Amino acid sequence: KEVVVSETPKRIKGLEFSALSAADIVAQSEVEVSTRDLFDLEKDRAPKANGALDPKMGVSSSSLECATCHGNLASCHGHFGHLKLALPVFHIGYFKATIQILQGICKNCSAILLSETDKRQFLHELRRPGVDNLRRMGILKKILDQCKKQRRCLHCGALNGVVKKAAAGAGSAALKIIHDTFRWVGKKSAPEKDIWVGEWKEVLAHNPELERYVKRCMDDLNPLKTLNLFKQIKSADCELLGIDATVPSGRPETYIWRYLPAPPVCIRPSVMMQDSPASNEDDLTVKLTEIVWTSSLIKAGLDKGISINNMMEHWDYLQLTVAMYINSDSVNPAMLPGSSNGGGKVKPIRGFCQRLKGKQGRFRGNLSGKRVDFSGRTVISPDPNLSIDEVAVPDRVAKVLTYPEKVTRYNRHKLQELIVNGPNVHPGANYLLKRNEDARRNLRYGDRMKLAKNLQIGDVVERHLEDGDVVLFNRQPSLHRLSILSHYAKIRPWRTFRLNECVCTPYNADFDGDEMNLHVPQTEEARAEAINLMGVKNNLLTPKSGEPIIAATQDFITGSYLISHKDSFYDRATLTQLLSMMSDGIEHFDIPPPAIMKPYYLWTGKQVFSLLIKPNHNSPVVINLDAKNKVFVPPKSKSLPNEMSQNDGFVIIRGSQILSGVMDKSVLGDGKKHSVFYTIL
Amino acid sequence: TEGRSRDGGLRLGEMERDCVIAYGASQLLLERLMISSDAFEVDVCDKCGLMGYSGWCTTCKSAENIIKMTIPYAAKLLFQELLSMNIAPRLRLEDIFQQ
Amino acid sequence: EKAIPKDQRATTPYMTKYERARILGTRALQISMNAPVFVDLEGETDPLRIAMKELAEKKIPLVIRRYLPDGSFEDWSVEELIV
Amino acid sequence: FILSKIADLVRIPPDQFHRDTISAITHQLNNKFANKIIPNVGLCITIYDLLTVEEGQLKPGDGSSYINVTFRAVVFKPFLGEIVTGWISKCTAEGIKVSLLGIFDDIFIPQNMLFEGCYYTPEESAWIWPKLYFDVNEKIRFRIEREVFVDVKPKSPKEREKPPAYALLGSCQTDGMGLVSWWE
Amino acid sequence: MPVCKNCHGTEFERDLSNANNDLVCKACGVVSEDNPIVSEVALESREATLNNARRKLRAVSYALHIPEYITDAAFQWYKLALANNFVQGRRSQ
Amino acid sequence: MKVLEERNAFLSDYEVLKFLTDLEKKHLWDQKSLAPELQGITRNVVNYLSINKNFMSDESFAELMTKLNSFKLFKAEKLQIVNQLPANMVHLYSIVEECDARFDEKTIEEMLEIISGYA
Amino acid sequence: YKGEVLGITRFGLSKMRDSVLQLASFEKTTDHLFDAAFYMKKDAVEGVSECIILGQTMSIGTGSFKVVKGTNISEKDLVPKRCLFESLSNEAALKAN
Amino acid sequence: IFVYQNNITPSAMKLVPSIPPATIETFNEAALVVNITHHELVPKHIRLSSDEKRELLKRYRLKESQLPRIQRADPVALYLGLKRGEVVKIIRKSETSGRYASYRICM
Amino acid sequence: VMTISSLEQRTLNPDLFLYKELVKAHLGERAASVIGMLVALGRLSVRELVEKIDGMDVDSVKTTLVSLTQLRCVKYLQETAISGKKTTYYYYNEEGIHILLYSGLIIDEIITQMRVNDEEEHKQLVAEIVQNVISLGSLTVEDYLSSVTSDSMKYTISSLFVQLCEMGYLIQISKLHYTPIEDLWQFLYEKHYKNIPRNSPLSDLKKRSQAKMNAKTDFAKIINKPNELSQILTVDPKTSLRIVKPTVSLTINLDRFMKGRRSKQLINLAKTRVGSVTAQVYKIALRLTEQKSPKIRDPLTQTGLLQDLEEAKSFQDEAELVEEKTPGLTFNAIDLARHLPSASLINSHLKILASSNFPFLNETKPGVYYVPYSKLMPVLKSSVYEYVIASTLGPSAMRLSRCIRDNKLVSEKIINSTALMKEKDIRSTLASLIRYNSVEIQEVPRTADRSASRAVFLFRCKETHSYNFMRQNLEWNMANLLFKKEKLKQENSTLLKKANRDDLLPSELNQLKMVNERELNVFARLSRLLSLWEVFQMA
Ligand SMILES: [Zn+2]
Ligand SMILES: [Zn+2]
Ligand SMILES: [Zn+2]
Ligand SMILES: [Zn+2]
């Protein structure tokens, strides 16, 4: 047996938009909602037999299976449902487009009403190979009003006129559309208008009530009649308006609703059942479950009873409803609601277009703004002793914030040991996942040990975290390209995020009480993406000015200043200890010749600070430079070099020794091109 | 979910998200707004692109032309949202390797 | 619109800044899957750092492929290329 | 039987990179095909040759190695009518369903050209000619005629075997057929 | 309710320590479900009469300063009381 | 995946069995190494291929073409002669179009003496 | 970039960019989708704020260049082999035709 | 090519573009007072020979379209009287770096 | 779901959904799929096709396209631009699939000329003739008679000789025969605007009507060039009789078939309102005049030129007189005893003409017995709708619809009075009528900005719609039906090849009868429709 299995990795190229057909919907969902609503109150709380909710449409709670594809909330992506609807309710989404497609076609024989090869010209202009979307829309903006200024249709003989979208904004008229007999001017003969007045002669003279008082309504298009009208030109122009028909969609007739697509349950989850029977509804579960009601009304209506007057206002309430189902827009057109109402004037009935739309809604604040996992948030606190490009992390968020590792060949005698610690002590792991891809093994029960004695190669463990794990670090509302950085994490006690003060300026970190965000990456190649590219050291500068944005600030400047102060001196014990403290140990210092000799021995601050730059003789740092710190004082103008001055001066460095001047921001000071921590880099 | 109390998780805003673009990191986003948040396998159908569960396309009963691939669950939720409303993000597909 | 022949190449022979990233990441990931490591591995461990350790030695066996806008492709060997 | 050219995209994990490339390509291909049957052609046997392997293109998400190649692997594709060895395996009243040891059970020869004069009796012959009965696990020469390619993987989720994906058919129109000692 | 896919033990515990809230077995320690998905945040003669009876009912209730609670128990008696049509032709009071 | 040439090279079994046995010698060599799942078919393959030879050579393939290139067998029986039925009597007649027909005596007979040269 | 000076507002941001999701990632998100699908816009996905949606890789930075490993093989081992199944059996079909 | 004085009637543009092989060019009298190409900000533009395009496009391996677009009916366009599918090489002298050039196609 | 009402194939495909089966069912595969693209997207060019079909360029398009042209299922127009080169472009040949869609009825055209030899070999002969003439394309009596046996009597073996003319049968088709009628109007639009002796820009009126009249009057002979041309009909070679020109290829005329079949529907309408004697009289009354009247022929330019709310009257009143005066000379004045079985004195029996009164005929030149048409035929067609909504919704529907006929825009309050029935019925038989359109709706806002309830509603007819979507009948079973023919074939598809080379098993014979009665339904069912189709689409 066993036919070969073949697959190829695919990625999305393009998104072809379209309306679904009238047919493809019912060709999709499993079950007609149809029926009625009721949500079957009996036996179970809302076991939901057929109806808007439905087990074979989807599920909500993790309780009961999904029928079609079951297995609860894990694997069921939802399915659709297709609400059968009586009469062709109009559509608010494509509405303003419907005013185009209908704007541009004669209202009688319904042939595209621009004519001859001119219409062909519009075509030949479109298909020219280099036309972009903007060009398209512009050409449409031409072809449309080009047919407006036509009067009589070409081969119908009938005339036509403007179509005005009756009134605006309320929802009373807002879904009703009107075109009329216009541009009659009354002096020219209109045989049509002659027919028109002769028509009413059999009403007024019969039923004088209506009379001329309420009059001059002309006519409208029943959203029914408008699809009976869309059904005419079923080819020909099409795209002239804007729709490619090789008939995947099959023309401009699906624009208006016929079968209304019921969304899955996983889109409209019933709110938690909570204590006691009523679980809160969830929008779409109430709107369309009412639309079923008003539908089956108009289905049982129009079947036997009702009346042409008491027919429509229902049907109108249908299009007004479903419009309110996919939008807000029309608010309260002197109506108030029906079954399942309230009526304490609940404003935000809008459930759909907006959840997709604005502010922090779906599309932006949710899909592009995705809230994330493997993170942490804490107050800050300075740590000078810690180097740059690290973030001290409290071990108590190191226990619970883990990094995945695939143990292979080099890691064992760490990891087969690293398990036996267990999740409680820090340098250890908690979750474990075997190559057999089962689910995973928490470290909860027991074992370990004899568990770690296996640990095959492709198995995965999750380390707590250690010294060296690359962690990217974020702060506030992030003003510019330096907020996200990445640091080698180092674990310490207490609890708070300790960065090195020098990196406070990119974050404009004030300490005080501000909060951070600690993000570990996950996949092995996102790490090497972080510290290497997005890390501190290489991003030491700024993107815009090519100017050092990390340097000494506050204490570091002034303290450095007080060592740089020409007044100062030191001694081989004091200096020796400084030149030590500058690096906690670890280094081989070659003490240069002392500045003055005789009345003791001393070393000027420019040296004890100079050795900072070139500690060894093997440190391959050789600099030289001139600069001006601020409050520079012009010398006696006779002296051309400014190095000699009333005080301090140029900072001019040669052979990586400081020669003249104090330092004091400026040279080490964050934000002038000429600079020490700049030049070294 | 959101904030303290309920349980963890933090915010990457479009104000912030842009940051990593300037650095130019693709892989950090795909780890970030994709793998680490909602990692999800949708089964789609090359022919007449739409989603579907396990083996069926269900608009065209096939159990043949479906291809398994991954995608942010917010994006799927964006489809089943859309396609509910009448509009159809059909997905034209092509393979990665070999042009 | 095929691979440009070996000798003639139009592009900077220096690495990009980003090249150094994806080379490490991809390489480091291949190290985490049980791949042989070409640089002598000193007593250190973990996948990413031995990759850096390796790129010191230009022992990475990869070829970086640069697509111009038109799709005229391109090749460079990681060894051939200068930091 | 025969040898044919196919192209496929193949994934070598980082493990085997020590092993020489062409062997790994071979190993993965055998892991992919072997017994498995490529449809609307008929089943492979193993990889025979290999050719025009080129620079493999990996994918950002994973980092395993992806090399697409093409080659000729040995398949089973006989000609149409063929007298060939085999024996009835599992049958009741109809033309016998022969197998061949160590290949498959899917050869089914119905009775049309099979000799008309016969009689069936719950024994071991299905049908006994005027020349006689044969027996399972026997050298038996039976002709082949037509083949049925079917795919049939239409699993409707709530249905949770019928595997005649590749099956061959023939009959016995001449002597020595169904029992080899009739000839010889 | 479910069983471990490996240990085949029926004892499940949801660990609340580390802000995972995973469900696990005390037996082999395999997890059942990670990622603990949680939620958050017509025309009838009978609806008219009934909800009207919660109106009239609740009316006489807090007049006597009885528990509002008990009203719901009584009401459903009224529900069952309507089932036998005992409530039809008498004085509503 | 995409298939290029389905009907490509008609392969009978002469050294094909020997070559598959060679690849087998390369990995573990079937049953006895004592003195991947791929093994399953090989012993199978070699099975049905070996029994008729018992119930072989190398140059005999090159020896086989000589007088056999002279016949009307086309490509079909011309491969079939290698294996099925002992190139004798009505056996060889049971296959190819117009098998006896025109060419009879030496054509049906020489197959016997030549198949005796190998089988 | 284009001929006329424009940009940066919700109107001007529709200028060249054909991506319906980024013009729908920004403002007027509804009628970009509707009015989009009405005209049956093709909408290739080349973008960045586009691709982060679908979760595939990016066309800039690290995502600018596919990376490849050398397969390290010479055609010397790639020559086919047969001892002519065909050619010997060929000459039986080369006559009477 | 001729010039307006004051009025432009839409009857003029109604049929302006009569001749297929030849064409028109129309200006306002006031529209030409200072010569725009000669002004200050507008840098020197060069109409490059129709063949020279092919050269250019083959340098950067650019197809057509996908170039910086100059809209038609532009004052610099009209002054130089560009037509469809024509390309101008602009030398922009701006003191940051120095004199450099960039190309634009008329649309 | 359930597939039995078949939704996928069931709605989004009007119009074209017919053709894409016809050319499919009646030709198949690649040959079909082109026309589907053509009709759908309209005008198209050779190379441009393969931009879409994915049809292996300049192979099928060449083969399939010219193949269609031989069957004249496409319209063909080529020219060059002024820039240079040259190019073609294609349309679907008018109806033209009209031919295929009718077929055996166009065979039933025999019944008119069925006289002389009645149900003879002659029947089977001319049957084979015409049924071949449609199957191939244009034919020539020289090359067909050449394919036909020699060495027998040629004017006899092929005895349809002078009968090649009649009304129907054939006309030499060339060039301007099939070109888009619109675009040939646009081409003839040259010579008139394009040719003016550079007089003055003043008064486009002299530039227009003159050019239009010249356009009109030149257009006339353009369609009359094919109408009849003697150099075909007149030829009388030596040792022979008057023949067509055996050389030129001639083709089946569609309109005289149109005309003739229309006559039948009038025979049906009159076959109601008068007596069988008077009926049969009228039945042979057209047989003399059935030649001339245009029916679908005169509107013609009505397609392909913008009307004018003035000049369109000059078109309609032109149609008012067109057949009346000069073609009236061709029409009934004094005619006697065409065949007939009333008996004995036949003259006052002929005076029965006056019995025809409503709503047709019943006029003449003052006292000669004659029937007007150029007024009648137009003022007739507007009646023909009638029934087609009796069994449909039930008879109670008609009278109210029919009521909405005479008076107009009439409120249901006074409908309830004018028609007669309780509310319970009127609500349904109206609402049941409105979903199927026809009646439509008017309304007016009543003390409203725009509101439903407080407003009041009116009705109307607007017959253009009501007639129009009765062409759902087109897509209705002229599509779905014909498919129910197709999907049937695959059941016996394995049998079809057998029954082809047979001329076995009992159950095979059983399903023979099954599929056969099945068929005999599907096509007779069709003819039932098509008879109801001929009205709406044209006239
Ligand atoms: Zn499900
Ligand atoms: Zn019209
Ligand atoms: Zn699909
Ligand atoms: Zn367990």
C-alpha distances (whole Å) from A20 to each of A238, B50, B84, I12, I326 are: 17, 11, 10, 11, 58
Q: Do C36 and D17 touch (CB under 8 A)?
A: yes
Query: Strands, E, within I391-512: which ranges?
Result: 442-444, 456-458
Report the distance separating Cα F100 and Cα F98, nearest Å. Answer: 6
Who's near A71: CB < 8 A, 6+ residues apart? Answer: A65
> What are the residues whose beta carbons fall under 8 Å from the beta carbon of A254, sequence distance 6 or more?
A19, A20, A21, A22, B86, I12
Q: Cβ neighbours of residue I453 under 8 Å, at least 6 residues apart?
A: A309, A310, A313
I426 near I434, Cβ under 8 Å?
no
Q: Which residues 13-52 of chain A have a CB within 8 Å of chain G?
A: 13-19
- For residue H11, the CA-to-ligand 2 centroid distance in Å is 29
Token code pair at residue B97: 């390797």
Peptide bond into I359 cis (omega under 30): yes
Which residue from I303, I411, I465 is facing A155, i.e. has the nearest CB?
I303
Say how far apart CA A441 and CA A455 lie, in whole Å.
Answer: 12
- Helices I29-41 and I17-26: crossing angle in degrees, nearest 10, is 160
Which is it for strands D166-169 and D146-149: parallel, antiparallel or unpaired?
A: antiparallel
Q: Relative to the alpha carbon of A71, which ligand is closest?
A: 1
Which residues is D12 bridged to in the sheet? D65
CB A651 within 8 A of CB A660: yes
CA trace torsion I174, I178, I181, I186 (10° rounding): -60
Helices assigned H by DSSP within A381-425: 395-398, 412-421
* Nearest Cα residue to B55 out of A16, A264, A68, A23: A68
**What distance in angstroms lies between residue E10's CA and the mean position of ligand 4's atoms?**
8
Look up residue A310 and give its amino acid: N
The alpha carbon of residue G77 is apart from the nearest alpha carbon of chain D, in Å, by: 8
Chain G residue numbers with beta carbons less than 8 Å from the beta carbon of H70 are 3
Of D52, D92, D100, D97, nearest in space to D72 by CA? D52
Q: Give CA angle at A539 (A534, A545), nearest 5°.
A: 130
Q: Are A490 and A467 spatial neighbours (Cβ–Cβ below 8 Å)?
A: yes
Alpha-helix runs per DSSP H in I54-196? 60-70, 97-102, 104-108, 110-113, 121-136, 141-147, 154-157, 181-188
Query: By the 8 A CB rule, do A61 and A76 touch?
Result: no
Distance CA I332, CA I361 (A): 12
**Candidates 3.30.565.10, 3.90.1300.10, 3.40.50.2300, 3.30.1490.120; correct CATH number of D1-76?**
3.30.1490.120
- Residue A133's nearest CA partner among G35, I40, B93 is G35
C-beta neighbour count of A665 within 10 angstroms: 20
Cβ-defined contact of A528 to C21 (cutoff 8 Å): yes
For residue G68, the chain C residue with the least C-alpha distance is: C63
CB atoms within 10 A of CB I266: 19
Ligand 1 centroid–CA A67 distance in Å is 6
Cα separations in angstroms, A169 against A88, A99, A172: 22, 15, 8
* CB-neighbour burial class of residue A318 (10 A; exposed 0-12, middle 13-18, buried 19+): buried
CA distance linking residue G29 with residue A357, whole number of Å: 6
Domain that holds residue C65: 1-83
- Is B24 touching C (CB cutoff 8 A)? yes
Decide if A651 contacts A663 (C-beta within 8 A): yes
Residue for token digits 């069931």?
Answer: I10
Cα–Cα distance measured from residue C20 to residue H9, given in angstroms and rounded to the nearest whole number: 65
Residue D100's beta-bridge partner residues?
Answer: D104
Residue A321 in contact with residue A328, Cβ under 8 Å? no
Ligand closest in space to the Cα of A157:
2
Contact G40 A243 (CB under 8 A): yes
Q: Does the beta-carbon distance from E19 to B8 stay under 8 Å?
A: yes
Q: After which residues is chain E broken (C to N over 2.5 A)?
A: 41
CB-CB under 8 Å, B27 with C18: no
E strands, A174-274, in order: 260-262
Which sign does the torsion angle of CA I199, I204, I208, I210 carry?
negative
- Using CB atoms within 10 A of its CB, is residue D43 exposed (0-12), middle (13-18) or buried (19+)? buried
Final resolution, Å: 4.1
Render C37-83 in DSSP notation, one character per residue: --S---S--SHHHHHHHHHTTT---EEE----TTS----EETTTSB-
At residue I191, the 3 state secondary structure works out as coil
Distances (CA, A) of E92 to A611, E66, E69, E78, E88: 102, 20, 22, 11, 8
Reported residue count of chain E is: 93
d(CA A111, CA A227): 14
* Residue pairs between chains B and E whose CB atoms are closer than 8 Å: 6
Chains that touch G (3 or more CB pairs under 8 A): A, B, C, D, F, H
The secondary structure of I266-291, three-state, reads: HHHHHHHHCCHHHHHHHHHHHHHHCC
CB A506 within 8 A of CB A487: no
> Edge to edge, what strands does the sheet with H44-47 contain?
H44-47, H87-93, H99-106, H69-70
Domain ranges for chain D, please list them.
1-76, 82-182
HSE-CB for H5 with a 13 A CA cutoff: 0
Tokens of A98: 């419907």
Of the candidates A327, A270, A260, A298, the one whose C-alpha atom is nearest the C-alpha of residue A83 is A260
State the distance from the centre of ligand 4 to the C-alpha of E26, rounded, in angstroms.
7
Q: In total, how many domains does chain C have? A: 1
Amino acid at I298: D
Domain that includes residue H59, residue range: 35-107
Indicate the pairing of strand B66-70 with strand B41-45.
antiparallel
Q: Give the C-alpha distances (Å, rounded to integers) separating A21 from A357, B86, C9, D92.
A: 25, 9, 52, 52
Domains and CATH numbers, chain A: 1-91+242-359 (no CATH), 92-241 (no CATH), 360-401+464-547 (2.40.40.20), 402-463 (3.30.1490.180), 548-681 (no CATH)
Amino acid in the structure at residue A564: S
d(CA A232, CA I43): 18
Q: Which of A517, D59, F51 is nearest to B17 (CA)?
A: A517
Instruction: Compute the Cα dihedral for H74, H80, H85, H89 and give only its sign.
Output: negative
Q: Amino acid identity of A103?
A: Q
Q: Is B19 annotated as belonging to a binding site?
A: no
Torsion sign (Cα): A237, A242, A245, A246: positive
D82-182 is classed CATH 3.40.50.1110: no
CA dihedral A486, A488, A494, A500 (to 10 degrees): -70
Task: Return d(Cα A535, Cα A114) in angstroms, integer.
Answer: 63
User: Which residue type occupies I65?
Assistant: L
**E strand or H helix at I206, and its extent?**
helix I204-227
Is A68 in contact with D9 (Cβ distance < 8 A)?
Answer: no
Report in angstroms the alpha-carbon separations of G75 from D50, G80, I288, I316: 10, 10, 88, 84
Q: Do D60 and B27 touch (CB under 8 A)?
A: yes
Ligand 4 centre distance from Cα of residue E23 (Å): 10
Which of these, A411, C39, C52, C30, lies nearest to D15 by C-alpha position? C30
> CA-to-CA distance for A185 and A129, rounded, in angstroms?
45
CA distance H79 to H51: 22
- State in Å: Cα G39 to ligand 2 middle: 24
DSSP state, A530?
I
- Inter-residue contact A265 to A60 (CB < 8 Å): yes
Residues 6+ apart with CB under 8 A from I392: I436
Question: Which of G63, G57, A17, G58 has the alpha carbon at shortest distance from B92?
Answer: A17
Token pair 């306002």 is found at H28
Number of H helices and E strands in chain F, helices first, is 6, 1
Which residue in G has a C-alpha nearest to residue C30's C-alpha? G69
- Which residues on neighbouring strands pair with residue D75, listed in sequence order? D44
CB-based contact, D20 to chain C, within 8 Å? no
Taking only Cα atoms into account, the Rg of chain A, rounded to an integer number of angstroms, comes to 39
Q: Nearest C-alpha of chain H: how many angstroms from G93?
A: 54
A327 vs A92: CA distance, rounded Å: 8
Domain at C37, CATH number:
3.90.940.10
- Residue A552 CA to residue A388 CA, distance in Å, equals 12
Structure tokens at A342: 């309230």
Is residue I418 within 8 Å of residue I403, measured between CB atoms? yes
Nearest bound ligand to the CA of residue I468: 2
User: E40 to chain B: which residues are within 8 Å by CB?
Assistant: 1, 6
SS3 state at D123:
coil
